[PDB]
Write a protein that binds this ligand. Structure first.
Ligand SMILES: Nc1ncnc2c1ncn2[C@@H]1O[C@H](COP(=O)(O)OP(=O)(O)OP(=O)(O)O)[C@@H](O)[C@H]1O
Length: 206
């Protein structure tokens, strides 16, 4: 397995998309905590897999920019993958950014940091069927990209994951992956294109 992702080598992000790139990476983390908290993770000085404790389970801006600019980066490439696939993104709708409301999580989510995630309630943002085919590409590119950095880091495939060694159970082509994760991946990137709409951006090629 060698992942061959889309060549974003020549795409350059325009400055008017800095806000939406920033404002998207802000929500990808709020979904991250929410999902971790739903699996039982808590806050800790450093990550503890045994205790299920994470240090980066803090407000987005408070993150270490080493582990924080990975959000902006992994999201910057998520916008630069759209321009490559033929789109152009334009902020056409002014009124969207005000009706935008964030989810009210139950109070048991607030932790030692007094921090409770607030994902966007993109409940009614139902993407047009053309925008669904787009997600399946991004949902697939996200795997080939994530696996591409793995092999350069040195990683290999194992029966189950060994955190110490380079062995992982999901360094396989997209065809071998499980339906649960394939949908899990596209569940997030569906919620990402929903964010461009939630702020009023048009995902239309000319
Ligand atoms: N350096 C890291 N920083 C933050 N999160 C990480 C890091 N490395 C791995 N993860 C998390 O690990 C997850 C992948 O783990 P995997 O899906 O194999 O098991 P899991 O879903 O964590 O299992 P469970 O949630 O039931 O314990 C990713 O969703 C990611 O959030």
């Amino acid at each position: 397995f060698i992942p061959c992702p889309v060549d974003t080598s020549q795409v350059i992000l325009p400055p008017h998309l800095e806000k939406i790139r920033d404002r998207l990476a802000e929500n990808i983390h709020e979904l991250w905590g929410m999902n971790k908290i739903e699996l039982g993770w808590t806050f800790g000085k450093i990550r503890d897999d045994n205790k299920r404790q994470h240090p980066c389970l803090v407000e987005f801006s408070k993150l270490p920019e080493t582990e924080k600019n990975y959000n902006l980066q992994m999201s910057t490439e998520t916008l630069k993958t759209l321009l490559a696939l033929g789109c152009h993104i334009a902020h056409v709708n002014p009124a969207a950014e005000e009706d935008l409301k964030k989810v009210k999580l139950p109070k048991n989510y607030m932790m030692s940091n007094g921090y409770k995630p607030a994902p966007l309630d993109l409940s009614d943002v139902k993407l047009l069927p053309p925008q669904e085919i787009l997600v399946d590409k991004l949902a697939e590119n996200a795997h080939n990209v994530w696996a591409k950095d793995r092999i350069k880091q040195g990683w290999t495939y194992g029966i189950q994951q060994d955190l110490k060694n380079k062995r992982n159970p999901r360094l396989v082509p997209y065809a071998l992956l499980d339906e649960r994760t394939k949908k899990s991946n596209r569940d997030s990137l569906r919620e990402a294109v929903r964010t461009f709409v939630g702020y009023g951006y048009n995902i239309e090629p000319s």
